[PDB]
Amino acid sequence: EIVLTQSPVTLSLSSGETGTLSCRASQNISSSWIAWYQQRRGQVPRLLISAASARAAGIPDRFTGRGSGTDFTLTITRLEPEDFGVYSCQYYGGSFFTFGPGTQVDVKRTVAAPSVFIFPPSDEQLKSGTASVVCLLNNFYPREAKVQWKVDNALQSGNSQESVTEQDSKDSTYSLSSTLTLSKADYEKHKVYACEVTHQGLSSPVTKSFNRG
Amino acid sequence: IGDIRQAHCNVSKATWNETLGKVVKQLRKHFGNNTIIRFANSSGGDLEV
C-alpha cells in the first residue's frame, strides 16, 4: 500500500504570515502523482495544486507547491481570511488512491486558557435510565486541549464523546464539549466524577470534580 | 451505445510526404525540370467524385 502523513497538524498563521505544510509518503513516488486540496468549513474540496507543482486554474500566487520522492511541501507566502480550513494531500499514482489525514490552519492569536465547567446529569434524565455528565472548555485559543474523565480517580475511555466548535470570528477562540454517557446502574457504581484539562496556556492541568448527591 | 464521434482515416505524414516528393520528380519528367507544381482539393460536383 501507499499511505500519506501530514506533519503540522494545526498550523497557526496571521495575515501576511508564511507557512509550510508537509506531506510525507511511505515509499518513493514520482513527483507527478501528488495533489493538494483546500477544504473550507466542511464545504466542497477545491483542487489547489496538481502534480505537486502545477498550480490549478484560478489558484492564486500565494500557493506554491514543491516536493520530490518522499516529502512534498505546500508553501503559503501570504494568506487572506479566505483561505483557512483543512488542507489535504492526495496520492493519485497507483491503482489505490489515498488521502492525507488533513491539516487545519488557524488565525494566529495570543495564548488563552480555557474556562472549564462541569455539569452533572439531571434527575429527569435519570428517570429514563441514562446518565450524561458534561465537561465544557470555553474560549481558549491554542488548539489541542486534552480532556480526561476520572471516575473515582480512575480514567475512562470509550463512552466519552466530544465535539468542538469552529474558530470564532471575533475573538478566534475555540470551545469543546465532552459528554460522558453511562447507564443507570453504571452511574450508581461510583460517586466522584471529574474531568481534567491539560492545556498549553493552562500552567497546570485543572480538574473540575463533583460528587453524586 | 456510448460516446459519439465522426469516422476518420489516418495516414502517416512522413510516408505521405515521401510519396509526394517521389511522385513530383516523375511528374517533372513530363512538365519540365526545375519547375513548380501544385495540387489543391477537389473542384466540385458529385459527392462520389
Next chain:
Amino acid sequence: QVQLVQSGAEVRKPGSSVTISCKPVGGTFTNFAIHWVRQAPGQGLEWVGGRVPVVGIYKYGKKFHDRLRLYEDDPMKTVFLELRSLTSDDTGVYYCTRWRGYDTSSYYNDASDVWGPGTKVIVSAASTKGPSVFPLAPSSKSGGTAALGCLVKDYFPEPVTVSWNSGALTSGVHTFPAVLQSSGLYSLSSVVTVPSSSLGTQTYICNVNHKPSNTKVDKKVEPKSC
C-alpha cells in the same frame, strides 16, 4: 467544464443495501474513471472504490469486499454505487469524484478536481421521533458567571433549531453539532453563560423546534444547587 450531480440523502436500516447515483453533465463519459470518496461524521476522507464506466477497469477498497458493487447505465449516462450489509460505521457523506482535462483510451490513475455535492447516508434503525428536551441547570458547581442549557436527545432527521427566550438571548449561546448515538437516534446540547446575579431573577427557557415531527418544546431551566 464538466459537472457531477448526485442523488438525495437517504436513511437505510442496518444490514440492508443502499444505491447512490452520479450523473455527469457536459463531458466525456468512458475516458476518466469515477471514484467514490466517503467521509464518516467527524473522521478523515476514505476512498471507497474506483471504476471506469463502460470499460470496466474497476477496483474496490480492501474494506469493501463482498459488500460493494459499482455499476453504470449508459442510456441514462449515470454511474451507481451499491453498498450492502450496512452498519453504523458506513453512515456518512459520500462524494462522487472525477478528473477533467480523439483520445479513446481509459484513465484510472488520476486525481479528482470535480466533486459532487455529496449524498448523506444514515444507517439507523428508527423512525421520525420527536425530541426529549432535558434541562441542564446551573448551581455552585463560578466567580460571577455561571452556565445553563438544554439537552436534546432521541430524535431524527435532525434539522432541529434551538433558540433562547424566542430569539431574545443570542450572545453566549453555543449550540453544538448533533451526534449519532449507538442506538440510532440523534442528540445534542445547547448551553449559554449568564451572570450569576440573574440566576433567580431572569427567567430562562429553551425553544426547541423539530420540523418533521412537528414538535415545539419550551422547557424552563430551574436551579436546585444540590
